[PDB]
Design an enzyme around this catalytic site. Sequence first.
Site, mmCIF file in Angstrom:
data_model
loop_
_atom_site.group_PDB
_atom_site.id
_atom_site.type_symbol
_atom_site.label_atom_id
_atom_site.label_comp_id
_atom_site.label_asym_id
_atom_site.label_seq_id
_atom_site.Cartn_x
_atom_site.Cartn_y
_atom_site.Cartn_z
ATOM 1 N N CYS A 115 14.868 -5.707 -4.228
ATOM 2 C CA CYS A 115 13.749 -6.008 -5.106
ATOM 3 C C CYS A 115 12.821 -6.715 -4.126
ATOM 4 O O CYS A 115 12.613 -6.218 -3.022
ATOM 5 C CB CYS A 115 14.205 -6.959 -6.214
ATOM 6 S SG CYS A 115 12.875 -7.522 -7.290
ATOM 7 N N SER A 116 12.260 -7.857 -4.497
ATOM 8 C CA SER A 116 11.438 -8.581 -3.543
ATOM 9 C C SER A 116 12.352 -9.626 -2.889
ATOM 10 O O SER A 116 12.482 -9.676 -1.660
ATOM 11 C CB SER A 116 10.263 -9.272 -4.219
ATOM 12 O OG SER A 116 9.442 -9.878 -3.237
ATOM 13 N N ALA A 117 12.999 -10.446 -3.716
ATOM 14 C CA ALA A 117 13.924 -11.471 -3.221
ATOM 15 C C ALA A 117 15.330 -10.879 -3.079
ATOM 16 O O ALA A 117 16.156 -11.381 -2.313
ATOM 17 C CB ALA A 117 13.953 -12.665 -4.182
ATOM 18 N N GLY A 118 15.587 -9.802 -3.820
ATOM 19 C CA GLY A 118 16.885 -9.156 -3.784
ATOM 20 C C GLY A 118 17.928 -9.936 -4.569
ATOM 21 O O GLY A 118 19.042 -10.129 -4.087
ATOM 22 N N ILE A 119 17.573 -10.394 -5.770
ATOM 23 C CA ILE A 119 18.502 -11.155 -6.608
ATOM 24 C C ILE A 119 18.198 -10.994 -8.100
ATOM 25 O O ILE A 119 19.113 -10.945 -8.922
ATOM 26 C CB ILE A 119 18.465 -12.681 -6.289
ATOM 27 C CG1 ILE A 119 17.120 -13.281 -6.719
ATOM 28 C CG2 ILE A 119 18.656 -12.915 -4.805
ATOM 29 C CD1 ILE A 119 17.054 -14.793 -6.600
ATOM 30 N N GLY A 120 16.912 -10.922 -8.442
ATOM 31 C CA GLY A 120 16.516 -10.797 -9.836
ATOM 32 C C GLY A 120 16.854 -9.466 -10.480
ATOM 33 O O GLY A 120 17.845 -9.346 -11.212
ATOM 34 N N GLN A 122 17.449 -14.179 -12.101
ATOM 35 C CA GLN A 122 16.587 -15.345 -11.938
ATOM 36 C C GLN A 122 16.077 -15.984 -13.227
ATOM 37 O O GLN A 122 15.473 -17.048 -13.177
ATOM 38 C CB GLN A 122 15.377 -14.984 -11.071
ATOM 39 C CG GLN A 122 15.696 -14.577 -9.639
ATOM 40 C CD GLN A 122 14.455 -14.138 -8.852
ATOM 41 O OE1 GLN A 122 13.857 -13.085 -9.124
ATOM 42 N NE2 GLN A 122 14.064 -14.950 -7.873
#
Length: 281
Positions: A214-219, A261
């Site tokens: 994703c962008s952060a790779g967690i949400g 998140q």
Amino acid sequence: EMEKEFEQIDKSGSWAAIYQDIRHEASDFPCRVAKLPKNKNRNRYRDVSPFDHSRIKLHQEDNDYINASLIKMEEAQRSYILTQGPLPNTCGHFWEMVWEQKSRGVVMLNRVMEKGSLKCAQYWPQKEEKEMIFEDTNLKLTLISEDIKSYYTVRQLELENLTTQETREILHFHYTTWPDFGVPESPASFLNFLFKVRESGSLSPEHGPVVVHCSAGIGRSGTFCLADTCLLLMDKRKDPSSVDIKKVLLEMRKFRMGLIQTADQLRFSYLAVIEGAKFIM
């Protein structure tokens, strides 16, 4: 079924409270390598680092760092490599990983630009006549085919190891319809996207771990993996109602921090798993 719990959390409006307790209970491991000065430009967010014990190591004698964690789901017999969206200077590393980890698929849950900002570099070629070449990691990437549907897009890319001249085909599954704010209104699209990926064989054991970002790779990345695993479990266990989303989420957070998140994404995961349990069963 967990749907009961679902409807009750809703009646009580205690999601933020259920979600917070998850954060408190979440594992906390060291991220030494990730915080070293030499790898500063290799991280997107200051607050999204991979635990050392589960980070993916590039096969470079030089610097083996890349913000990416391997999530190993023992019982589900499923593994995923979660990662941040490639940065201007880490696209070669990104593909080097895909190559060294023998990944077959790459799942993108964001658009290059969201809310008028760049959420990640354009790491794949948009026109088949204009291949890409990553000189630092010595890899070549070529667009082979692109199929654009309403809520997602599938691309067949060709990855070549210019060193050994060996070639592999990576399927790139891109979910293009996640809203800029909040979560999807209906898990319908997400579940189809998930199933499309499963069908490709990108999640199957014969291949390396599917790379998910994703962008952060967690949400959104958490949502994807959590739904997939919970569905697999309900699918192989004698008593499907025994699958606890909350317990699985915490099992995953032992490998990468922050998955899911928001208390709102948590609900949506619950939602996706339930609807997905019905489409399966």
